[model samples]
Target chain A: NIPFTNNLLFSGQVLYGDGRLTAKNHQLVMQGDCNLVLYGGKYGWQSNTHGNGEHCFLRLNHKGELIIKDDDFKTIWSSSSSSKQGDYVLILRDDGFAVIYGPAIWETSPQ
Target chain B: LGTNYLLSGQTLETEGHLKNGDFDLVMQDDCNLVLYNGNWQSNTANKGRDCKLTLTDYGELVINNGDGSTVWRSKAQSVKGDYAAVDHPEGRLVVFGPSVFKIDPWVPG
Candidate 1:
């Protein structure tokens, strides 16, 4: 098994609202209200969709999108990115970038 | 809750410590797991030598001596799932797991 680190979000894993992916001082949190945010030194990126989606959770779907779904499993928000085979991995890099690696590379901050 | 912590199966050898700012959780040569630099300690001094502090896979925080005997342990234990010993920057060392509800310091300050 790959040693578990707090920063990596493996494919097919679910991140509950209380869960967070972190590296150094930066973190990507799925808030209780279903809002997904990335913070570094201060609040940075956010999905900005918050309301009535109390038990919302984040999942890296087969389509390679980091989607947030409500308790009923309806998609509320997503990263709006995609990969060829849907086997992508999300990592909160130490330099404060949430990078997605697979067939298609994507990141929150432009390097 | 943050990055400065030890996951299950991680360890602190004798004299090794996890630090967050001024807070230090040390596994001293004397075998006491001290959260100093005060107020919190395992009181396991002299119990054994060359002890190591471990957050076991079963979610138990324990100090194991060279002789393979348990010198001390946390009261909390998880029935299932992973756990961690998080060293909060705010002068507190906390353990987290599903069934880990209460944590009583071995030697209260």
Candidate 2:
């Protein structure tokens, strides 16, 4: 069984077609906060199409484990660099950087 | 003897006096209305009655009775000509040339 974790955050739109991963032809628009590591398979993440499979359009490999497809079955383009285990928020900064908020809380005030 | 004349949002009360001439009132783009005495021959002041006037976006000027309603108005549409429409290309509002045009960033405006 796939051990789906809950530390991963996914917040965006994902598109799929005919139960297969189509990256070029599909589009995804993501926003807000979404957590889906433990509920991976429920959100369309699997290993059957990961590693060595033309059917797999995208795959997110973390700690030797693979989260195959995104919510809409589209391939994953990027992954979170931090491996800290905790509840945090993912912020898309204005500078086009996707950062993760760890246990060290920082006030997001008006700069 | 003419009756009271109701301007757009202003009320002009005057005695019964009128002459044969065009009573022109110009409304600016900012909703400012100015009354002009077209005929210089007549010294009579235009009398204003009890009425309510409301201007719509499409240039429609409505004048209602004393009961706080519209009785007469211009046949112009209620849309304002100053603001530009939404951009089809970027799906945003932007200024285009002399006229404001809507443009979708993905597509040409």
Candidate 3:
């Protein structure tokens, strides 16, 4: 589990894609240069895959929406569709419900 | 039609009915079961049920439902099998393999 604090530090390369991180879904990509600290919510990281590209990591709340932040810790990638905030825990339940547990925040983003 | 339930490794006659729903089967890593749905959305609700049988390390077979819930589980107390069965009435029958459909089964009553 990724640590939850005002500052979450991460060092090394991170990648993202579809299906297993290396499937290359062509959505977003980023490589961390130094120890990047992501605040609030939960964060996940994957190793770098050479041939298939890097394993895309994700940091989001329970709604499967990315929780973006700037270097100074500001809201960047919110579930743009929702405006609810609370202490939520994103759990990868055995049933595959990658859910965020907080308040009842409906999905505002179109599926 | 309503969804039918079965334990892992059990066989369903199918009766030629358009089977739907999903089921889950617990097994060891080496003795896993596989699911196969005809291009339908594979999930606990859709293709996780209505399967023929759940294979076990002891070579046992149990029936499964298609809601991605496991009716039958292995008693080997270890990982097994390559595929598991899932039935989805609204979706289709899906075989969960190691590479694809790696979604862990949620043990619900």
Candidate 4:
């Protein structure tokens, strides 16, 4: 389990990037690449965050938005997924799904 | 509204919402019972405003938004004592109100 306290990936922090969150399968990665993607078994569920430019990293900002940002921290891509100002977990399950969970939310999964 | 079934004469107030996943069912201030998908909105027929909607005990679902301003009513305003809101297995939001059942249309809007 990832230790979640203030600001870190899978750590329940409300900021986007500065760290990397990988799937338990160790294939998918949410990195500064700004592409939450899978590759180990199939590199399956890409956030398709491409074409939005680079340096994009994952962040759950102070406003509780799930955003992908470039080096400038401007949003290159976004899920528009928001929550109350609180902690969350971005888990990439072995079943081939990725999600940011905490409070009322949505799953970036097929099911 | 927590369950799929609502007893007759029941109102799912604005504060009450039934949801599954990102899909949410809420009573609009305009008296529209709306289904929402993140930024998108689904069918509930934009027919009323400031609505206080209810599924009548005998039948018929009325859109009475503000005051007693009723903008529209259901064709089901005839019988039964319950209404339903379901995320059908087919990936549609279906509403069974006092007097009508409409497969909530899926529009990107």
Model 3: per-residue Cα lDDT over A1-111, one tens digit each: 332211111111122232121111111223332111211122332222223222324454433234434344544333342324432323232223222322221110111
What lDDT is obtained when candidate 4 is compared to the true structure? 0.45
Please give the ranking of all candidate structures by TM-score, highest first, separated by commas.
Answer: 1, 4, 3, 2
Q: On a 0 to 1 TM-score scale, where does candidate 1 land against the true structure?
A: 0.49
Tell me the docking grade of candidate 3. Answer: incorrect
DockQ of 4: 0.02
Could you tell me how far off, in angstroms, the CA of residue B31 lies in candidate 2 after the best superposition? 19
User: What docking grade does candidate 1 earn?
Assistant: incorrect
Single out the weakest 10-residue window by summed lDDT for candidate 1 chain A. A102-111
Best by DockQ: 3
Candidate of highest lDDT: 1
How much lDDT does candidate 1 score? 0.65
Question: Where does candidate 2 chain B have its weakest 10-residue lDDT segment?
Answer: B84-93
Tens digit per residue, CA lDDT, model 3, B10-76:
4543232323333222222222232333332112233343443444433233435544445454322
* TM-score of model 4 (CA atoms): 0.35
Q: Report, for every candidate in turn, its global Cα lDDT versus the true structure.
A: 0.65, 0.26, 0.29, 0.45
Q: TM-score of chain B, candidate 1? A: 0.81
Segments of candidate 4 deviating more than 4 angstroms: A1-8, A11-19, A24-26, A31-33, A41-43, A62-64, A104-111, B1-109
Chain B TM-score, candidates in order? 0.81, 0.31, 0.25, 0.55
Model 3 chain A is weakest, by summed lDDT over 10 consecutive residues, at: A4-13
DockQ for each numbered candidate? 0.02, 0.01, 0.04, 0.02
Q: Candidate 4, residues B4-97: lDDT per residue as tens digits?
A: 2233456766546655455565677645565565333323445555556565554455566556766655543324433333332222333332
